[PDB]
């Protein structure tokens, strides 16, 4: 929780590749076998690509939005233009392949700091792209709970901390 920077408010890019807790399988999954190539994708548009604001007393949604879109990517303007992504994997011979899709996100924070630690923190998740997990299976095989389910938000890439001081 320690942060080595001066007193004041900051907007920070925490990076791409964040996935959210409990929504692992919301988009569904895909089953194939015996050398079949399975493909899953999505053309994200505004009606299915919803940003998640977790605001705070001093930092409301409009405040998060304007400061993020001024320094980093304007996700409102970008949302008007459909963009596709897809993943493919070939099922192995004589075995079955399961493959499920979930949205990835850019995590943004707006933090207040007193020179030792973050005092306040609002969070914004902007829809980015997607991520597939796959597993080989058969009907008799039990598999790890944690494959299907993420209990805490995490980043499948390396986390980042790129900062700008608001009202310097």
């Amino acid at each position: 929780n320690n942060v080595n920077l001066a007193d004041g408010n900051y907007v920070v890019n925490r990076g791409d590749g964040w996935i959210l807790s409990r929504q692992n399988q919301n988009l569904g999954g895909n089953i194939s076998n015996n050398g079949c190539t399975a493909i899953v994708g999505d053309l994200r548009i505004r009606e299915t690509a919803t940003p998640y604001y977790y605001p705070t007393a001093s930092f409301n949604e409009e405040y998060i939005k304007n400061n993020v879109q001024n320094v980093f990517a304007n996700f409102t303007e970008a949302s008007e233009i459909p963009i596709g992504f897809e993943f493919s994997k070939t099922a192995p011979s004589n075995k079955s392949l399961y493959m499920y899709l979930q949205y990835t996100y850019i995590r943004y924070e707006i933090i207040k700091v007193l020179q030792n630690t973050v005092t306040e923190r609002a969070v914004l998740y902007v829809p980015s792209l997607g991520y597939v997990k796959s597993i080989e299976f058969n009907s008799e095989e039990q598999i790890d709970k944690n494959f299907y389910f993420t209990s805490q938000d995490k980043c499948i890439l390396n986390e980042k901390f790129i900062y700008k001081k608001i009202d310097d």
């Binding site: 919301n26 999954g29 089953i31 399975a38 999505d42 499920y100």
Partner: protein, 420 residues
Amino acid sequence: QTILPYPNGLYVINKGDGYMRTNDKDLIGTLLIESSTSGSIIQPRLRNTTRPLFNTSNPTIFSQEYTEARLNDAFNIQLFNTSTTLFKFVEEAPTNKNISMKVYNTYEKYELINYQNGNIDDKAEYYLPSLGKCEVSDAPSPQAPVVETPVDQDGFIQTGPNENIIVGVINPSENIEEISTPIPDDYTYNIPTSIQNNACYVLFKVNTTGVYKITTKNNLPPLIIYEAIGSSNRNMNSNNLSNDNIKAIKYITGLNRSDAKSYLIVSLFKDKNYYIRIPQISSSTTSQLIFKRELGNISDLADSTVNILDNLNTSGTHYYTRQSPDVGNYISYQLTIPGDFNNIASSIFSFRTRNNQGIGTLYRLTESINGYNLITINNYSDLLNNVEPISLLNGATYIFRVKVTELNNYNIIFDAYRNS
């Protein structure tokens, strides 16, 4: 018909992907792919509309809309009958043989249950349209004999990987109280008068990570405590609980049985949000929720209900029936054995369980050093019909911890046998 080791309430269970109706009711179609040819079947989402399936045991209470609201509480499913996701299957046939490609629509089966006293009182099944199934095999001989086979029973079959993810959700007909200020080491919360009319939850967090004793005044009624799933990270303020209206909850410990006078010993963490469910109390006098930070080795009990055992002045059989914890988890019993305290061992005791097997650890609870202390008296490998006598000092307080090892029944029965 498995034992669900959970308290009363609402649960949404994801019972897996790859569900489809029988009798090729979800067959998109079959491609015959000749040798040295590729074949492909595409769901390109040229229309976004999907067709979820739904069944319910009571349509008035568990209506489709109500079930959808619970699926949102549990998994944050946003869209129930529109998708922008595409799926596609591609396969090249080998040079020597033709191949058959059979593609089906599939569903994820979500099950909403109202769970009461170890029974499913209300049951709804929601089938969320998923991203399909493809079966490829060697192309069948068109000369193959035609076997007259009856249409099989109407219903679903599962063709995906085994899955059973249980997520509790807040009962939305029970109000949520919030302690906005992160609680200090010692806190007392006055339960408002609405508790007379229905059960409630109290949302809170702790200021300092540690083990805590949670109990009502006079240890009745019993409490249940859950953790909000996914509350960590996310928004934060110094001396203020950040509510994200997370309604997905993970059961920690506690039970519903109304005569189970008890307290909770739970390991709570600063970065999490917790819910305590206080049942309906019909009394006209105000009840309190008491939090007390515990230092020292009473943490051995961490995440356990501690059942206070009463009327043990008689000798022999003393049964106590309680909701069994799951395999690997604790249930505990506190015993202040009868008689006046000098150093005579009170009528030798023998401890056993009846339905479920468990490990078992006997502690003497030290009362007033500087905080409480547990002294390990003895361990027991098996508890089911265990009859190793032990002599406890009259007037002393002992705690017996049971770590469950086989879950045969919803209830675990504990017998404190008072021998001579």
